[PDB]
Amino acid sequence: DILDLEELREYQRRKRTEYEGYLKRNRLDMGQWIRYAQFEIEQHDMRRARSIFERALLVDSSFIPLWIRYIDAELKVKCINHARNLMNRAISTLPRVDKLWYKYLIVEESLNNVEIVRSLYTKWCSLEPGVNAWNSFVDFEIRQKNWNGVREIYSKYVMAHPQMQTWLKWVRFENRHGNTEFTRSVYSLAIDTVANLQNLQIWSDMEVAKLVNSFAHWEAAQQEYERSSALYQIAIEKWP
Amino acid sequence: RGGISYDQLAKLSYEKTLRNLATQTQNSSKQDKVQKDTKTGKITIADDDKLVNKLAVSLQSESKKRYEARKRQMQNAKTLYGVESFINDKNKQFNEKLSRES
Amino acid sequence: KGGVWTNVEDQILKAAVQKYGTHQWSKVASLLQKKTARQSELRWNEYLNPKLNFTEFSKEEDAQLLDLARELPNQWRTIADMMARPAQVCVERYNRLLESEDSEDEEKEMLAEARARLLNTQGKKATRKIRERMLEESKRIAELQKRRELKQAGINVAIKKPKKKYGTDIDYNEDIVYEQAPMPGIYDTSTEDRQIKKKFEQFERKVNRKGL
Amino acid sequence: AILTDQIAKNVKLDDFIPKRQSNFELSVPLPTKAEIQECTARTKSYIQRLVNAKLANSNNRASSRYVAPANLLLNNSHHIEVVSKQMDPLLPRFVGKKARKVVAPTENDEVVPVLHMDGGEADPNEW
Amino acid sequence: SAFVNKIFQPEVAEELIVNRYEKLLSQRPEWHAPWKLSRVINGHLGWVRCVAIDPVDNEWFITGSNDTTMKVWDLATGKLKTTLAGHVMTVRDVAVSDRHPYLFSVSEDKTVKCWDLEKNQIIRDYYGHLSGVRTVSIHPTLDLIATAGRDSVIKLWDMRTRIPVITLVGHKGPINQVQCTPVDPQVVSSSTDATVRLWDVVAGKTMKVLTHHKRSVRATALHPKEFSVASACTDDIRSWGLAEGSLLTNFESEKTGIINTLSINQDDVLFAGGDNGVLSFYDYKSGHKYQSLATREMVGSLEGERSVLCSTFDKTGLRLITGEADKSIKIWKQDETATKESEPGLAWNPNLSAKRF
Amino acid sequence: YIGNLITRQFEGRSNEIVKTTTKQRLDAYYDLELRNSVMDDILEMMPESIRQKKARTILQHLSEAWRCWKANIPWDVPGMPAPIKKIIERYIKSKADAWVSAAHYNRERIKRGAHVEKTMVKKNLGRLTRLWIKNEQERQRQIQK
Amino acid sequence: EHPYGKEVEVLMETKNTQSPQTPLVEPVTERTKLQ
Amino acid sequence: TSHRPQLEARSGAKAAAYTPTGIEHARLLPGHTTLKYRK
Amino acid sequence: DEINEPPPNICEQCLGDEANIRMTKIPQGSECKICTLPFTLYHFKTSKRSNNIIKTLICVRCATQRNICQCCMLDSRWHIPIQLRDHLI
Ligand SMILES: [Zn+2]
Ligand SMILES: [Zn+2]
């Protein structure tokens, strides 16, 4: 084992000559890059350890385990502002990749920075990424109890994914809380938009039947059978 | 059946870390800013010294658990199979790969 | 001189094909003393192949065989492919089916030689690289303990650097090698830079004293 | 909403969306004849100055066949004539010129957003 | 409608998924007449890898191939004029000059050669590519050529002095296709790093990097009018507006899989030859796939042989010469006496499920 | 000549020596371009998640298919994905067209006596004996069918 | 008999119909010479 | 080992930063110094 | 860029007191002291009858990155050495 600093200085030269030799022959082999970048973290020289990950990103910046390991290397040494810059370059280079967005979130979740995940989610849901992002963004506000904020999301979420399983998710939100004045307002908005946008042909016959039935069976539980009954006539006439 | 795509597995591992973060807040309950520079465009965020240690220790501990789970999986992988003749560990490792293909 | 096959040589040949493959028969005969690469190929393709068909004769098989030997008279390599069977077995049963109408002392040393040759896979270049790497570390271990024993006497002698092979050879210990600094970030890593430098300088102070 | 801009500034939604989808008759004009000539005469003058650099620097004597002073310094405090030295035809011209090899750093000031679309992603074990 | 803007009150009123979708149904694509096979030419000993047309007077086309030889075919009768040997590996791209009687051809043997078509001999060879060269493009009105290949660089060659004048260094993979336009950006390139670059050849740097494709951008094609390029990855074809680098339109290429070639017509017909043999014709200004054909290989060949490798239109634009892997050259005629009625093509039906638009 | 000799003394030789193709290294450069074309077409048929490991294993089926072709052994991998088996057979036939046509071309040179290398006479003998048996084995199956 | 369905002309070409020295582009000779 | 397939080709990015040598090749000697233009 | 190159960074006190200075340009003169890579050697004399040739020792890129002159390698403003400059800041 290493005794003094001069034996350490000769130990570090032998490994760094070795690893830089295999990376000179193989620019590729991302696993070889990380094992030499992990070596420099063990030597407690983070200036070198940042450099190998930066050099490895110049070879293959689309390799996701390389991004996560360099982010985790900045987090394990408590360099939080080095990680914020790094995850910012992660999501600005590869905005499609879901892992890089969830990595930004659960670190700022871990720091209880609720205004930074909210600013992050507003940007991420502006690029129209998919239903996994929005559903984790409506689950974020339920944690924060922001009931007025999560109602603003479903206003935008039905405009990004116009389909009944996003509209019926919003009425499963409102009927979970029992607010009757808010639920039929969503129900009135959902059935008018099918009528307003009839010519676009984006809701199928089986798909509009889920909206009419879930409207009617809710009105049956609200003891107003005459509204349950009349909407069946307008829907059959509106769609014969 | 199928494998899990990298969008779902990112979501599921996101939810597991939220549940684990929720129980850390539950256990911390039971046991008891942004300033932008004028000179530069650089931005400064006030943080507690806790929850940065707690994130770093958690990332280290998860790395320990996954390392030892794979290490124990290494132990089982070289102690289970002994039927086919081999030459080294890498032979049995490659012929486990051919058994996985069947 | 034409030998018969012992069960020892039978097992060496099966393990040889398992490693070398079916087309390298001079590789197989190298393990197998007293036997020819032709003889090794002939046995595996007539006897030892587990794909071959050494079993009982259903009455479909006997009717098919007497059909084929009547339609293709005396063409046994053809018939054995139509029957998907070995050929002299197919003759042996056709000989029998018509008779229905009636009115270690040395070997283990070869096996010890075969057991070692199958389990040594490297060649000249890899075994030599192993030897040079073990001898290089042995020279390294020698020079370090030299320096420690001189340090026992108090007289300090530094480790010599490796000699440059070519002109622009890089001392990787000397400098940050190809310093690709990270892109300038907005979140202001200023307190973090101070704490790593203090922690890295603290780490270098620990190595001089306690020795890692 | 304390830092609304400073997350992923280089990527916008407008880069994803097509432009002919709003009107199929959007006019992308061809370059005008006065515009190709301003670009040709700039390109041809730049490349002819490059070919003359390669031919003059070659040691072949038969390459002049096929082919800036008084600059200001110190905020024009000193007018300085720039002249050339008459080279010895036997000494090697370009004394600092060797065949040496250089690795080059990459200048990365801005990140290029890799603008794919989202996600038809279901797949069995067929591949 | 106005209901969406008064209730779901937007900040842009275009960036909704509905307001984009209703404008696609509000517009109809131009009708184009369908295409049919007219002549099959069997002359090569290997695959046909590249086809170039005579840019002046339109008499002949030339097909470099996998049997290392370029053959010159008459366009009208289909007969064989001459054979140009002189590469030792497969000819990958062929370009004929309009201002010159010069024929430029690259191959996988690292060679870029010029050909005096008044003499049919190799003159003026070029040197410097580290690996095999894949494409040629002759600059209009500058006397350059642009070659690129597996070296991830674009060498801009002076014709007369044979000098690698400008090397454009930006890519990360082998370059599949290169184009030359008369104004900035004067070189358009596509490589296997899923990028399309727009080059400023005087500075030697990229004006705009187009990172929109997912996989290797195998083929681009310049529009003869309206100043745009269309690039084809392994399923998505995207038309690009040069001088801004703007994504003009996103085509309806679904399950096309590996497009081996593109060619754009004067009449806004975009061809997309795929490796699966399925060749499809699109409306250029809209993106509507209005015809999808499949080819027949030969009397006997493999099922992989049904693949279009290279394609061009002639100068009139009414003919489509495609070279395929079955050692054949197929000429595709857009049939006359078809109307908007009785030959509508495929129906214009955009969807929300595909996020293409 | 001496001007290149003296400038090589004062400056050293250039590091950018790009070797042209030659008769010496035509079979080697043919394979480097054939392996890149197969590695491209398979990596584009892949849906996702393919790395330098998975691209490395698939190119060995290309080599195994060419050895089965020369042996006239049917190359059938159980569990092979049918688009990828379609790609490899497309290029094995592509290499086979060059392999056979070079055997016809060099045979005509040996009869004329027109400067064939001593190695190539042994190589052309080795190519025709595979073509003769492959024509022989095919003639055996046409009688059998 | 022949594939592709009789609208398609299939032709197999194994010999050149031009001389190799025939110029593929005719040379521009403006002034008439009598030498 | 020691006999390997290429994972990638030698890029022209590396030769672009090198300093030139200016050695005189026989095939870069001046020849066909006049271009022919089409009518 | 070999045909587009910056003008040389030289001090005022290197040039001295005279108005017009005849400077000699050699396009690939010596190699840099710092980067060991060739550059355009400028050299000149203060007066016509001087006896000391003042050469540019470093290239313009090494002179820009340090913000020093090419001849005496002092800082362009403040005219101090680099080691004293980085100690005052
Ligand atoms: Zn310098
Ligand atoms: Zn000075």
From Swiss-Prot, chain B:
- Compartments (UniProt record): Nucleus
**Taxonomic superkingdom:** Eukaryota
Q: Where is the composition biased (Polar residues)?
A: 20-32
Per the record, the similarity remark reads: Belongs to the SYF2 family.
What is this protein's function? Involved in pre-mRNA splicing and cell cycle control. As a component of the NTC complex (or PRP19-associated complex), associates to the spliceosome to mediate conformational rearrangement or to stabilize the structure of the spliceosome after U4 snRNA dissociation, which leads to spliceosome maturation. The cell cycle arrest of SYF2 defective cells may be due to the inefficient splicing of TUB1.
| Known partners and oligomeric status | Belongs to the NTC complex (or PRP19-associated complex), composed of at least CEF1, CLF1, ISY1, NTC20, SNT309, SYF1, SYF2, and PRP19.
Q: What else is known?
A: Present with 1670 molecules/cell in log phase SD medium.
Protein's recorded name:
Pre-mRNA-splicing factor SYF2
Species assigned in the record: Saccharomyces cerevisiae (strain ATCC 204508 / S288c)
Q: Coding gene?
A: SYF2
Which start and end residues of the full protein are shown?
92 to 211 of 215
From Swiss-Prot, chain C:
Specify the effect of W76G: No effect. Slower growth and thermosensitivity. Complete loss of function. Complete loss of function
Q: Quote the DNA-binding region ranges, renumbered to this chain.
A: 25-48, 76-98
Q: What is the effect of changing W44G?
A: No effect. Slower growth and thermosensitivity. Complete loss of function. Complete loss of function
Q: Where is the HTH myb-type domain?
A: 1-52, 55-102
List membrane-spanning regions: none
The subcellular localization recorded is: Cytoplasm; Nucleus
Please explain the role this protein plays, according to its UniProt record: Involved in pre-mRNA splicing and cell cycle control. Required for the binding of the NTC complex (or PRP19-associated complex) components to the spliceosome to mediate conformational rearrangement or to stabilize the structure of the spliceosome after U4 snRNA dissociation, which leads to spliceosome maturation. Its absence leads to an arrest of the cell cycle, possibly due to the inefficient splicing of TUB1.
Quaternary state and interactors: Belongs to the NTC complex (or PRP19-associated complex), composed of at least CEF1, CLF1, ISY1, NTC20, SNT309, SYF1, SYF2, and PRP19.
One further remark on this entry is: Present with 784 molecules/cell in log phase SD medium.
* Family of this protein: Belongs to the CEF1 family.
Task: Name it.
Answer: Pre-mRNA-splicing factor CEF1
**What is the originating organism of this protein?**
Saccharomyces cerevisiae (strain ATCC 204508 / S288c) (Baker's yeast)
Quote the range of the complete protein represented: 9 to 253 of 590
From Swiss-Prot, chain E:
* Protein task: Involved in pre-mRNA splicing. May also be required for cell cycle progression at G2/M.
State the source organism's domain of life: Eukaryota
- GO biological process annotations for this chain's record? mRNA splicing, via spliceosome
Q: Which UniProt keywords apply?
A: Cytoplasm, mRNA processing, mRNA splicing, Nucleus, Repeat, Spliceosome, WD repeat
Chief location bin: cytoplasm
Where are the annotated WD repeats, by residue?
Answer: 43-74, 86-116, 128-158, 170-200, 212-241, 254-283, 303-333
In the UniProt record, the signal sequence range is none
Name used for this protein in its record: Pre-mRNA-splicing factor PRP46
Similarity annotation: Belongs to the WD repeat PRL1/PRL2 family.
Subunit structure and binding partners: Belongs to the CWC complex (or CEF1-associated complex), a spliceosome subcomplex composed of the U2, U5 and U6 snRNAs and at least BUD13, BUD31, BRR2, CDC40, CEF1, CLF1, CUS1, CWC2, CWC15, CWC21, CWC22, CWC23, CWC24, CWC25, CWC27, ECM2, HSH155, IST3, ISY1, LEA1, MSL1, NTC20, PRP8, PRP9, PRP11, PRP19, PRP21, PRP22, PRP45, PRP46, SLU7, SMB1, SMD1, SMD2, SMD3, SMX2, SMX3, SNT309, SNU114, SPP2, SYF1, SYF2, RSE1 and YJU2. Interacts with CEF1, CLF1, NTC20, PRP45 and SYF1.
Q: Where in the cell is it found?
A: Cytoplasm; Nucleus
The terms describing its cellular component in GO are: catalytic step 2 spliceosome; cytoplasm; Prp19 complex; spliceosomal complex
Other comments on record: Present with 1770 molecules/cell in log phase SD medium.
Curated annotation (Swiss-Prot), chain I:
Kindly list the places in or outside the cell where this protein is found, as annotated in its UniProt entry.
Nucleus
Top-level lineage group: Eukaryota
Quaternary structure and partners: Belongs to the CWC complex (or CEF1-associated complex), a spliceosome subcomplex composed of the U2, U5 and U6 snRNAs and at least BUD13, BUD31, BRR2, CDC40, CEF1, CLF1, CUS1, CWC2, CWC15, CWC21, CWC22, CWC23, CWC24, CWC25, CWC27, ECM2, HSH155, IST3, ISY1, LEA1, MSL1, NTC20, PRP8, PRP9, PRP11, PRP19, PRP21, PRP22, PRP45, PRP46, SLU7, SMB1, SMD1, SMD2, SMD3, SMX2, SMX3, SNT309, SNU114, SPP2, SYF1, SYF2, RSE1 and YJU2. Interacts with SLU7.
Family, per the entry?
Belongs to the SLT11 family.
Further remarks about this protein from its record = Present with 4260 molecules/cell in log phase SD medium.
Function, in words: Involved in pre-mRNA splicing. Facilitates the cooperative formation of U2/U6 helix II in association with stem II in the spliceosome. Binds to RNA.
Designated name of the protein: Pre-mRNA-splicing factor SLT11
